[PDB]
mmCIF file of all heavy atoms in Angstrom:
data_model
loop_
_atom_site.group_PDB
_atom_site.id
_atom_site.type_symbol
_atom_site.label_atom_id
_atom_site.label_comp_id
_atom_site.label_asym_id
_atom_site.label_seq_id
_atom_site.Cartn_x
_atom_site.Cartn_y
_atom_site.Cartn_z
ATOM 1 N N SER A 593 1.285 -46.829 117.353
ATOM 2 C CA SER A 593 1.355 -46.390 118.744
ATOM 3 C C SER A 593 0.252 -47.028 119.583
ATOM 4 O O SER A 593 0.505 -47.536 120.684
ATOM 5 C CB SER A 593 1.274 -44.865 118.815
ATOM 6 O OG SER A 593 0.028 -44.397 118.328
ATOM 7 N N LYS A 594 -0.987 -47.007 119.090
ATOM 8 C CA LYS A 594 -2.039 -47.699 119.820
ATOM 9 C C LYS A 594 -1.843 -49.210 119.784
ATOM 10 O O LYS A 594 -2.371 -49.907 120.653
ATOM 11 C CB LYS A 594 -3.422 -47.308 119.288
ATOM 12 C CG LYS A 594 -3.717 -47.708 117.858
ATOM 13 C CD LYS A 594 -4.450 -49.036 117.787
ATOM 14 C CE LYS A 594 -5.046 -49.264 116.410
ATOM 15 N NZ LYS A 594 -5.648 -50.619 116.284
ATOM 16 N N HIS A 595 -1.070 -49.730 118.825
ATOM 17 C CA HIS A 595 -0.652 -51.125 118.918
ATOM 18 C C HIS A 595 0.221 -51.347 120.146
ATOM 19 O O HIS A 595 0.056 -52.347 120.854
ATOM 20 C CB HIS A 595 0.112 -51.562 117.664
ATOM 21 C CG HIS A 595 -0.628 -51.339 116.380
ATOM 22 N ND1 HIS A 595 -1.942 -50.926 116.330
ATOM 23 C CD2 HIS A 595 -0.238 -51.504 115.094
ATOM 24 C CE1 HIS A 595 -2.321 -50.824 115.067
ATOM 25 N NE2 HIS A 595 -1.306 -51.171 114.298
ATOM 26 N N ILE A 596 1.152 -50.427 120.413
ATOM 27 C CA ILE A 596 1.952 -50.513 121.632
ATOM 28 C C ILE A 596 1.053 -50.410 122.854
ATOM 29 O O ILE A 596 1.259 -51.104 123.856
ATOM 30 C CB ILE A 596 3.038 -49.421 121.645
ATOM 31 C CG1 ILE A 596 3.932 -49.517 120.406
ATOM 32 C CG2 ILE A 596 3.874 -49.518 122.914
ATOM 33 C CD1 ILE A 596 4.619 -50.855 120.236
ATOM 34 N N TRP A 597 0.053 -49.532 122.798
ATOM 35 C CA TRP A 597 -0.879 -49.408 123.917
ATOM 36 C C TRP A 597 -1.603 -50.727 124.171
ATOM 37 O O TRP A 597 -1.741 -51.165 125.318
ATOM 38 C CB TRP A 597 -1.892 -48.297 123.649
ATOM 39 C CG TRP A 597 -3.046 -48.328 124.608
ATOM 40 C CD1 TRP A 597 -3.051 -47.886 125.900
ATOM 41 C CD2 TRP A 597 -4.357 -48.847 124.357
ATOM 42 N NE1 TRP A 597 -4.287 -48.090 126.465
ATOM 43 C CE2 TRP A 597 -5.106 -48.680 125.538
ATOM 44 C CE3 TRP A 597 -4.970 -49.434 123.247
ATOM 45 C CZ2 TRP A 597 -6.438 -49.078 125.641
ATOM 46 C CZ3 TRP A 597 -6.293 -49.828 123.350
ATOM 47 C CH2 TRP A 597 -7.012 -49.648 124.538
ATOM 48 N N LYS A 598 -2.082 -51.368 123.103
ATOM 49 C CA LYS A 598 -2.785 -52.638 123.248
ATOM 50 C C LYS A 598 -1.857 -53.720 123.782
ATOM 51 O O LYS A 598 -2.264 -54.548 124.604
ATOM 52 C CB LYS A 598 -3.384 -53.061 121.906
ATOM 53 C CG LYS A 598 -4.768 -52.489 121.640
ATOM 54 C CD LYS A 598 -5.435 -53.162 120.454
ATOM 55 C CE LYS A 598 -6.899 -52.770 120.341
ATOM 56 N NZ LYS A 598 -7.075 -51.311 120.090
ATOM 57 N N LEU A 599 -0.609 -53.741 123.313
ATOM 58 C CA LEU A 599 0.352 -54.713 123.822
ATOM 59 C C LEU A 599 0.607 -54.499 125.310
ATOM 60 O O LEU A 599 0.674 -55.463 126.083
ATOM 61 C CB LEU A 599 1.656 -54.616 123.034
ATOM 62 C CG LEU A 599 2.591 -55.824 123.086
ATOM 63 C CD1 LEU A 599 3.575 -55.748 121.933
ATOM 64 C CD2 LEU A 599 3.324 -55.917 124.416
ATOM 65 N N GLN A 600 0.752 -53.240 125.728
ATOM 66 C CA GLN A 600 0.941 -52.946 127.144
ATOM 67 C C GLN A 600 -0.272 -53.379 127.956
ATOM 68 O O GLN A 600 -0.133 -53.928 129.055
ATOM 69 C CB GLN A 600 1.208 -51.454 127.335
ATOM 70 C CG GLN A 600 2.527 -50.973 126.750
ATOM 71 C CD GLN A 600 3.733 -51.549 127.465
ATOM 72 O OE1 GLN A 600 3.998 -51.220 128.622
ATOM 73 N NE2 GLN A 600 4.474 -52.409 126.776
ATOM 74 N N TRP A 601 -1.470 -53.129 127.430
ATOM 75 C CA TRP A 601 -2.695 -53.534 128.112
ATOM 76 C C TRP A 601 -2.757 -55.051 128.266
ATOM 77 O O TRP A 601 -3.120 -55.570 129.331
ATOM 78 C CB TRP A 601 -3.896 -53.004 127.326
ATOM 79 C CG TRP A 601 -5.215 -53.591 127.698
ATOM 80 C CD1 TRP A 601 -5.647 -53.915 128.947
ATOM 81 C CD2 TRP A 601 -6.284 -53.920 126.804
ATOM 82 N NE1 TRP A 601 -6.920 -54.424 128.888
ATOM 83 C CE2 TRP A 601 -7.333 -54.442 127.583
ATOM 84 C CE3 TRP A 601 -6.455 -53.825 125.419
ATOM 85 C CZ2 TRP A 601 -8.535 -54.868 127.027
ATOM 86 C CZ3 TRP A 601 -7.650 -54.250 124.869
ATOM 87 C CH2 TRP A 601 -8.674 -54.765 125.671
ATOM 88 N N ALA A 602 -2.399 -55.778 127.207
ATOM 89 C CA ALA A 602 -2.387 -57.235 127.275
ATOM 90 C C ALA A 602 -1.369 -57.729 128.293
ATOM 91 O O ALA A 602 -1.647 -58.657 129.062
ATOM 92 C CB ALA A 602 -2.088 -57.822 125.897
ATOM 93 N N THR A 603 -0.180 -57.124 128.309
ATOM 94 C CA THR A 603 0.827 -57.514 129.288
ATOM 95 C C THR A 603 0.334 -57.258 130.704
ATOM 96 O O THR A 603 0.559 -58.075 131.604
ATOM 97 C CB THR A 603 2.132 -56.759 129.038
ATOM 98 O OG1 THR A 603 1.841 -55.402 128.689
ATOM 99 C CG2 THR A 603 2.922 -57.410 127.914
ATOM 100 N N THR A 604 -0.333 -56.124 130.924
ATOM 101 C CA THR A 604 -0.887 -55.841 132.244
ATOM 102 C C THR A 604 -1.896 -56.908 132.649
ATOM 103 O O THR A 604 -1.819 -57.468 133.748
ATOM 104 C CB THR A 604 -1.537 -54.458 132.259
ATOM 105 O OG1 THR A 604 -2.352 -54.296 131.092
ATOM 106 C CG2 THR A 604 -0.476 -53.370 132.291
ATOM 107 N N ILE A 605 -2.842 -57.222 131.762
ATOM 108 C CA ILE A 605 -3.833 -58.243 132.093
ATOM 109 C C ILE A 605 -3.138 -59.550 132.447
ATOM 110 O O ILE A 605 -3.445 -60.190 133.462
ATOM 111 C CB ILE A 605 -4.819 -58.452 130.930
ATOM 112 C CG1 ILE A 605 -5.571 -57.166 130.596
ATOM 113 C CG2 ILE A 605 -5.799 -59.561 131.283
ATOM 114 C CD1 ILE A 605 -6.290 -57.237 129.269
ATOM 115 N N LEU A 606 -2.181 -59.961 131.618
ATOM 116 C CA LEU A 606 -1.631 -61.302 131.751
ATOM 117 C C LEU A 606 -0.710 -61.422 132.957
ATOM 118 O O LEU A 606 -0.703 -62.459 133.624
ATOM 119 C CB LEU A 606 -0.916 -61.695 130.465
ATOM 120 C CG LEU A 606 -1.919 -61.863 129.325
ATOM 121 C CD1 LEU A 606 -1.225 -61.751 128.010
ATOM 122 C CD2 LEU A 606 -2.635 -63.198 129.438
ATOM 123 N N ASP A 607 0.075 -60.386 133.266
ATOM 124 C CA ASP A 607 0.896 -60.481 134.468
ATOM 125 C C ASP A 607 0.048 -60.314 135.724
ATOM 126 O O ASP A 607 0.390 -60.874 136.771
ATOM 127 C CB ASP A 607 2.048 -59.470 134.438
ATOM 128 C CG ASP A 607 1.583 -58.046 134.267
ATOM 129 O OD1 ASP A 607 0.372 -57.803 134.379
ATOM 130 O OD2 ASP A 607 2.435 -57.165 134.023
ATOM 131 N N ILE A 608 -1.074 -59.588 135.644
ATOM 132 C CA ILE A 608 -2.024 -59.595 136.752
ATOM 133 C C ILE A 608 -2.520 -61.013 137.004
ATOM 134 O O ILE A 608 -2.505 -61.502 138.140
ATOM 135 C CB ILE A 608 -3.196 -58.637 136.473
ATOM 136 C CG1 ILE A 608 -2.719 -57.185 136.471
ATOM 137 C CG2 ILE A 608 -4.297 -58.831 137.501
ATOM 138 C CD1 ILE A 608 -3.614 -56.257 135.676
ATOM 139 N N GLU A 609 -2.960 -61.697 135.946
ATOM 140 C CA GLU A 609 -3.433 -63.069 136.118
ATOM 141 C C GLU A 609 -2.323 -63.971 136.644
ATOM 142 O O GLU A 609 -2.526 -64.720 137.604
ATOM 143 C CB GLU A 609 -3.989 -63.616 134.800
ATOM 144 C CG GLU A 609 -5.072 -62.755 134.166
ATOM 145 C CD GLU A 609 -6.375 -62.793 134.938
ATOM 146 O OE1 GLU A 609 -6.487 -63.606 135.879
ATOM 147 O OE2 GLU A 609 -7.288 -62.008 134.605
ATOM 148 N N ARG A 610 -1.135 -63.895 136.044
ATOM 149 C CA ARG A 610 -0.018 -64.724 136.477
ATOM 150 C C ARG A 610 0.377 -64.444 137.920
ATOM 151 O O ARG A 610 0.946 -65.324 138.574
ATOM 152 C CB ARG A 610 1.180 -64.493 135.554
ATOM 153 C CG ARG A 610 2.326 -65.481 135.724
ATOM 154 C CD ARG A 610 1.972 -66.850 135.163
ATOM 155 N NE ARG A 610 3.053 -67.814 135.339
ATOM 156 C CZ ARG A 610 3.284 -68.490 136.457
ATOM 157 N NH1 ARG A 610 2.526 -68.338 137.530
ATOM 158 N NH2 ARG A 610 4.305 -69.343 136.497
ATOM 159 N N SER A 611 0.093 -63.243 138.428
ATOM 160 C CA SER A 611 0.469 -62.910 139.797
ATOM 161 C C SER A 611 -0.237 -63.817 140.798
ATOM 162 O O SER A 611 0.405 -64.428 141.659
ATOM 163 C CB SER A 611 0.148 -61.443 140.082
ATOM 164 O OG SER A 611 -1.249 -61.214 140.039
ATOM 165 N N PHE A 612 -1.558 -63.920 140.698
ATOM 166 C CA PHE A 612 -2.353 -64.725 141.611
ATOM 167 C C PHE A 612 -2.820 -66.006 140.934
ATOM 168 O O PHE A 612 -2.894 -66.082 139.703
ATOM 169 C CB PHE A 612 -3.573 -63.943 142.121
ATOM 170 C CG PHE A 612 -4.444 -63.386 141.030
ATOM 171 C CD1 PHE A 612 -5.478 -64.137 140.499
ATOM 172 C CD2 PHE A 612 -4.240 -62.103 140.550
ATOM 173 C CE1 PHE A 612 -6.283 -63.625 139.500
ATOM 174 C CE2 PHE A 612 -5.045 -61.587 139.552
ATOM 175 C CZ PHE A 612 -6.068 -62.350 139.027
ATOM 176 N N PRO A 613 -3.138 -67.048 141.712
ATOM 177 C CA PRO A 613 -3.562 -68.318 141.106
ATOM 178 C C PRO A 613 -4.744 -68.156 140.161
ATOM 179 O O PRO A 613 -5.842 -67.783 140.585
ATOM 180 C CB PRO A 613 -3.925 -69.180 142.323
ATOM 181 C CG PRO A 613 -3.155 -68.597 143.451
ATOM 182 C CD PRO A 613 -3.080 -67.127 143.183
ATOM 183 N N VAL A 614 -4.523 -68.439 138.876
ATOM 184 C CA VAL A 614 -5.575 -68.255 137.880
ATOM 185 C C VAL A 614 -6.561 -69.416 137.915
ATOM 186 O O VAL A 614 -7.777 -69.218 137.812
ATOM 187 C CB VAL A 614 -4.959 -68.084 136.481
ATOM 188 C CG1 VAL A 614 -6.027 -67.654 135.479
ATOM 189 C CG2 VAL A 614 -3.823 -67.081 136.529
ATOM 190 N N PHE A 615 -6.057 -70.645 138.056
ATOM 191 C CA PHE A 615 -6.918 -71.824 137.984
ATOM 192 C C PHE A 615 -8.044 -71.801 139.010
ATOM 193 O O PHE A 615 -8.937 -72.652 138.939
ATOM 194 C CB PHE A 615 -6.107 -73.119 138.155
ATOM 195 C CG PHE A 615 -4.848 -72.959 138.958
ATOM 196 C CD1 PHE A 615 -4.902 -72.654 140.306
ATOM 197 C CD2 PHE A 615 -3.608 -73.105 138.357
ATOM 198 C CE1 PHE A 615 -3.744 -72.509 141.043
ATOM 199 C CE2 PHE A 615 -2.446 -72.955 139.088
ATOM 200 C CZ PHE A 615 -2.514 -72.657 140.432
ATOM 201 N N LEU A 616 -8.030 -70.863 139.954
ATOM 202 C CA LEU A 616 -9.177 -70.666 140.822
ATOM 203 C C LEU A 616 -10.406 -70.330 139.980
ATOM 204 O O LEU A 616 -10.334 -70.165 138.760
ATOM 205 C CB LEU A 616 -8.903 -69.553 141.833
ATOM 206 C CG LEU A 616 -7.588 -69.665 142.604
ATOM 207 C CD1 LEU A 616 -7.375 -68.440 143.480
ATOM 208 C CD2 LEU A 616 -7.560 -70.934 143.440
ATOM 209 N N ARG A 617 -11.554 -70.218 140.648
ATOM 210 C CA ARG A 617 -12.823 -70.008 139.952
ATOM 211 C C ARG A 617 -12.922 -68.561 139.461
ATOM 212 O O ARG A 617 -13.815 -67.795 139.820
ATOM 213 C CB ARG A 617 -13.987 -70.376 140.863
ATOM 214 C CG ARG A 617 -13.829 -71.731 141.545
ATOM 215 C CD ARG A 617 -13.590 -72.849 140.539
ATOM 216 N NE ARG A 617 -13.435 -74.147 141.184
ATOM 217 C CZ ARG A 617 -14.433 -74.970 141.482
ATOM 218 N NH1 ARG A 617 -15.691 -74.666 141.200
ATOM 219 N NH2 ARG A 617 -14.161 -76.129 142.074
ATOM 220 N N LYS A 618 -11.957 -68.205 138.609
ATOM 221 C CA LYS A 618 -11.899 -66.890 137.981
ATOM 222 C C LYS A 618 -11.486 -66.999 136.518
ATOM 223 O O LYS A 618 -11.039 -66.005 135.932
ATOM 224 C CB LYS A 618 -10.922 -65.976 138.725
ATOM 225 C CG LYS A 618 -9.642 -66.665 139.184
ATOM 226 C CD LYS A 618 -8.833 -65.778 140.112
ATOM 227 C CE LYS A 618 -9.472 -65.680 141.489
ATOM 228 N NZ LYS A 618 -8.562 -65.056 142.485
ATOM 229 N N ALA A 619 -11.632 -68.174 135.917
ATOM 230 C CA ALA A 619 -11.133 -68.433 134.579
ATOM 231 C C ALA A 619 -12.171 -68.024 133.536
ATOM 232 O O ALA A 619 -13.171 -67.364 133.831
ATOM 233 C CB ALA A 619 -10.754 -69.905 134.437
ATOM 234 N N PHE A 620 -11.926 -68.427 132.298
ATOM 235 C CA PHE A 620 -12.781 -68.148 131.156
ATOM 236 C C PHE A 620 -13.840 -69.237 131.001
ATOM 237 O O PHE A 620 -13.642 -70.396 131.378
ATOM 238 C CB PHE A 620 -11.922 -68.031 129.897
ATOM 239 C CG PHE A 620 -10.862 -69.088 129.807
ATOM 240 C CD1 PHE A 620 -11.191 -70.416 129.599
ATOM 241 C CD2 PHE A 620 -9.533 -68.749 129.969
ATOM 242 C CE1 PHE A 620 -10.204 -71.381 129.534
ATOM 243 C CE2 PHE A 620 -8.553 -69.709 129.915
ATOM 244 C CZ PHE A 620 -8.883 -71.026 129.694
ATOM 245 N N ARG A 621 -14.977 -68.845 130.433
ATOM 246 C CA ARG A 621 -16.174 -69.672 130.467
ATOM 247 C C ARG A 621 -15.907 -71.064 129.901
ATOM 248 O O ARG A 621 -14.971 -71.290 129.131
ATOM 249 C CB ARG A 621 -17.312 -68.991 129.699
ATOM 250 C CG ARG A 621 -17.548 -69.502 128.282
ATOM 251 C CD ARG A 621 -18.812 -68.915 127.686
ATOM 252 N NE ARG A 621 -20.013 -69.415 128.341
ATOM 253 C CZ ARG A 621 -20.513 -70.632 128.167
ATOM 254 N NH1 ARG A 621 -19.947 -71.502 127.346
ATOM 255 N NH2 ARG A 621 -21.610 -70.984 128.832
ATOM 256 N N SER A 622 -16.757 -72.006 130.305
ATOM 257 C CA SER A 622 -16.728 -73.378 129.833
ATOM 258 C C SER A 622 -17.808 -73.566 128.771
ATOM 259 O O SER A 622 -18.451 -72.610 128.333
ATOM 260 C CB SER A 622 -16.913 -74.340 131.007
ATOM 261 O OG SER A 622 -17.056 -75.673 130.551
ATOM 262 N N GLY A 623 -18.026 -74.804 128.357
ATOM 263 C CA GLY A 623 -18.981 -75.104 127.305
ATOM 264 C C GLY A 623 -19.398 -76.557 127.308
ATOM 265 O O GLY A 623 -19.427 -77.208 128.356
ATOM 266 N N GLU A 624 -19.724 -77.061 126.119
ATOM 267 C CA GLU A 624 -20.275 -78.402 125.973
ATOM 268 C C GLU A 624 -19.420 -79.426 126.708
ATOM 269 O O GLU A 624 -18.209 -79.253 126.872
ATOM 270 C CB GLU A 624 -20.376 -78.758 124.488
ATOM 271 C CG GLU A 624 -20.882 -80.162 124.200
ATOM 272 C CD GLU A 624 -22.232 -80.438 124.830
ATOM 273 O OE1 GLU A 624 -23.051 -79.500 124.921
ATOM 274 O OE2 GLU A 624 -22.473 -81.595 125.234
ATOM 275 N N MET A 625 -20.063 -80.504 127.153
ATOM 276 C CA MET A 625 -19.399 -81.513 127.972
ATOM 277 C C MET A 625 -18.842 -82.664 127.137
ATOM 278 O O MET A 625 -17.637 -82.927 127.164
ATOM 279 C CB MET A 625 -20.375 -82.048 129.028
ATOM 280 C CG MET A 625 -20.402 -81.261 130.337
ATOM 281 S SD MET A 625 -18.789 -81.025 131.119
ATOM 282 C CE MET A 625 -17.987 -82.592 130.780
ATOM 283 N N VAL A 626 -19.705 -83.361 126.392
ATOM 284 C CA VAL A 626 -19.331 -84.597 125.711
ATOM 285 C C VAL A 626 -19.978 -84.636 124.330
ATOM 286 O O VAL A 626 -20.865 -83.844 124.006
ATOM 287 C CB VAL A 626 -19.730 -85.843 126.533
ATOM 288 C CG1 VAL A 626 -21.240 -86.049 126.499
ATOM 289 C CG2 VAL A 626 -18.989 -87.085 126.043
ATOM 290 N N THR A 627 -19.509 -85.582 123.513
ATOM 291 C CA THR A 627 -20.070 -85.857 122.193
ATOM 292 C C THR A 627 -19.843 -84.699 121.226
ATOM 293 O O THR A 627 -18.757 -84.578 120.649
ATOM 294 C CB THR A 627 -21.562 -86.187 122.308
ATOM 295 O OG1 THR A 627 -21.752 -87.206 123.296
ATOM 296 C CG2 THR A 627 -22.103 -86.679 120.972
ATOM 297 N N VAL A 628 -20.852 -83.849 121.028
ATOM 298 C CA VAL A 628 -20.734 -82.786 120.033
ATOM 299 C C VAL A 628 -19.578 -81.857 120.381
ATOM 300 O O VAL A 628 -18.876 -81.357 119.494
ATOM 301 C CB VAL A 628 -22.065 -82.020 119.908
ATOM 302 C CG1 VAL A 628 -21.869 -80.741 119.109
ATOM 303 C CG2 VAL A 628 -23.120 -82.901 119.258
ATOM 304 N N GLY A 629 -19.365 -81.609 121.670
ATOM 305 C CA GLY A 629 -18.281 -80.753 122.108
ATOM 306 C C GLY A 629 -17.198 -81.484 122.874
ATOM 307 O O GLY A 629 -16.663 -80.951 123.850
ATOM 308 N N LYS A 630 -16.861 -82.699 122.445
ATOM 309 C CA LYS A 630 -15.774 -83.468 123.034
ATOM 310 C C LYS A 630 -14.656 -83.620 122.013
ATOM 311 O O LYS A 630 -14.915 -83.826 120.822
ATOM 312 C CB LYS A 630 -16.248 -84.851 123.500
ATOM 313 C CG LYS A 630 -16.331 -85.927 122.411
ATOM 314 C CD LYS A 630 -16.540 -87.313 123.007
ATOM 315 C CE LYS A 630 -17.057 -88.295 121.966
ATOM 316 N NZ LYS A 630 -17.473 -89.590 122.570
ATOM 317 N N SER A 631 -13.414 -83.521 122.479
ATOM 318 C CA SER A 631 -12.267 -83.690 121.597
ATOM 319 C C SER A 631 -10.994 -83.685 122.428
ATOM 320 O O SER A 631 -10.952 -83.110 123.519
ATOM 321 C CB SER A 631 -12.205 -82.585 120.540
ATOM 322 O OG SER A 631 -11.176 -82.834 119.599
ATOM 323 N N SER A 632 -9.963 -84.333 121.893
ATOM 324 C CA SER A 632 -8.653 -84.405 122.541
ATOM 325 C C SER A 632 -7.694 -83.346 122.001
ATOM 326 O O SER A 632 -6.626 -83.664 121.477
ATOM 327 C CB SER A 632 -8.074 -85.804 122.369
ATOM 328 O OG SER A 632 -7.852 -86.096 121.001
ATOM 329 N N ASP A 633 -8.068 -82.073 122.120
ATOM 330 C CA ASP A 633 -7.203 -80.965 121.727
ATOM 331 C C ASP A 633 -6.611 -80.238 122.926
ATOM 332 O O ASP A 633 -5.447 -79.827 122.885
ATOM 333 C CB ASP A 633 -7.980 -79.968 120.859
ATOM 334 C CG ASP A 633 -7.146 -78.762 120.461
ATOM 335 O OD1 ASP A 633 -5.905 -78.820 120.587
ATOM 336 O OD2 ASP A 633 -7.734 -77.755 120.015
ATOM 337 N N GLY A 634 -7.385 -80.076 123.995
ATOM 338 C CA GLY A 634 -6.895 -79.462 125.213
ATOM 339 C C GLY A 634 -7.946 -79.482 126.302
ATOM 340 O O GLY A 634 -9.112 -79.165 126.048
ATOM 341 N N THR A 635 -7.551 -79.854 127.519
ATOM 342 C CA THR A 635 -8.495 -79.992 128.622
ATOM 343 C C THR A 635 -9.449 -81.144 128.324
ATOM 344 O O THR A 635 -9.533 -81.595 127.173
ATOM 345 C CB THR A 635 -9.267 -78.687 128.843
ATOM 346 O OG1 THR A 635 -10.200 -78.489 127.773
ATOM 347 C CG2 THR A 635 -8.310 -77.503 128.907
ATOM 348 N N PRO A 636 -10.181 -81.655 129.319
ATOM 349 C CA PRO A 636 -11.085 -82.785 129.054
ATOM 350 C C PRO A 636 -12.175 -82.436 128.054
ATOM 351 O O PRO A 636 -12.219 -81.316 127.538
ATOM 352 C CB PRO A 636 -11.671 -83.107 130.437
ATOM 353 C CG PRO A 636 -11.372 -81.920 131.289
ATOM 354 C CD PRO A 636 -10.110 -81.337 130.755
ATOM 355 N N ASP A 637 -13.060 -83.394 127.775
ATOM 356 C CA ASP A 637 -14.103 -83.217 126.771
ATOM 357 C C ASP A 637 -14.926 -81.960 127.025
ATOM 358 O O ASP A 637 -15.648 -81.498 126.136
ATOM 359 C CB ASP A 637 -15.027 -84.438 126.729
ATOM 360 C CG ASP A 637 -15.397 -84.940 128.111
ATOM 361 O OD1 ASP A 637 -14.919 -84.356 129.105
ATOM 362 O OD2 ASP A 637 -16.170 -85.918 128.202
#
C-alpha cells in the first residue's frame, strides 16, 4: 500500500515537472566538467 503511495507521489512530482518547462534553471545538480568527469553517455562532458 505504501508502495502505491510512493508511486502516486512520484507521479505527482513528475507530472508537476512535466507541466512547466523543466529545462529552466530548476533542474538537478551538475558536476565535473571535463577529463575525470567527461564521457559520452548523456549530456555534454
Side-chain angles (χ1 to χ4, degrees):
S593 63
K594 64 95 166 174
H595 305 353
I596 303 302
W597 167 78
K598 273 192 170 63
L599 200 162
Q600 293 293 291
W601 166 38
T603 40
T604 46
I605 300 166
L606 292 159
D607 57 11
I608 292 156
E609 306 289 352
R610 191 73 181 82
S611 65
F612 55 89
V614 190
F615 27 67
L616 310 175
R617 311 305 180 88
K618 40 190 74 168
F620 43 69
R621 100 172 291 285
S622 173
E624 177 56 34
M625 272 307 323
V626 73
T627 309
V628 168
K630 82 169 162 189
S631 186
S632 63
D633 178 16
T635 72
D637 43 359

